[PDB]
Design a protein around this nucleic acid. Structure first.
Length: 71
RNA sequence: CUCGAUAACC
RNA sequence: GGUUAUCGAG
C-alpha cells in the first residue's frame, strides 16, 4: 500500500524520470487479472501476477523494484 | 458518472 | 423490453 511512492521518491532523490507503469489486463472482464512492470531508469521489473485491481498490480511491481534497489 | 462484463430471473 | 445482484475500469 506504500511502495508506489517510496520509489517515486527514489526518482526524486536521483533526478530520474517518474516511474512508467504497465498493466497486463487479461481474463473475463469481470474476473480481470493484472500483472505489472515498472520501467524506471528504463529498467523493467515484473510484478507477481494475478492481482484483482490495477493498484495491487503496480504495488507488487513497486514492492519488487525496491527489492532490487536495496542491492 | 460513464463504459466493459457475469450470474439470474421473469 | 425490462429487473435484482456481482465485479473490474478511466
Amino acid at each position: 500500500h506504500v511502495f508506489k511512492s517510496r520509489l517515486q521518491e527514489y526518482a526524486q532523490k536521483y533526478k530520474l524520470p517518474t516511474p512508467v507503469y504497465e498493466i497486463v489486463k487479461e481474463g473475463p472482464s469481470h474476473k480481470s487479472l493484472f500483472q505489472s512492470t515498472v520501467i524506471l531508469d528504463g529498467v523493467r521489473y515484473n510484478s507477481l501476477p494475478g492481482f484483482f485491481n490495477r493498484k495491487a498490480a503496480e504495488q507488487s511491481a513497486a514492492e519488487v523494484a525496491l527489492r532490487e534497489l536495496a542491492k
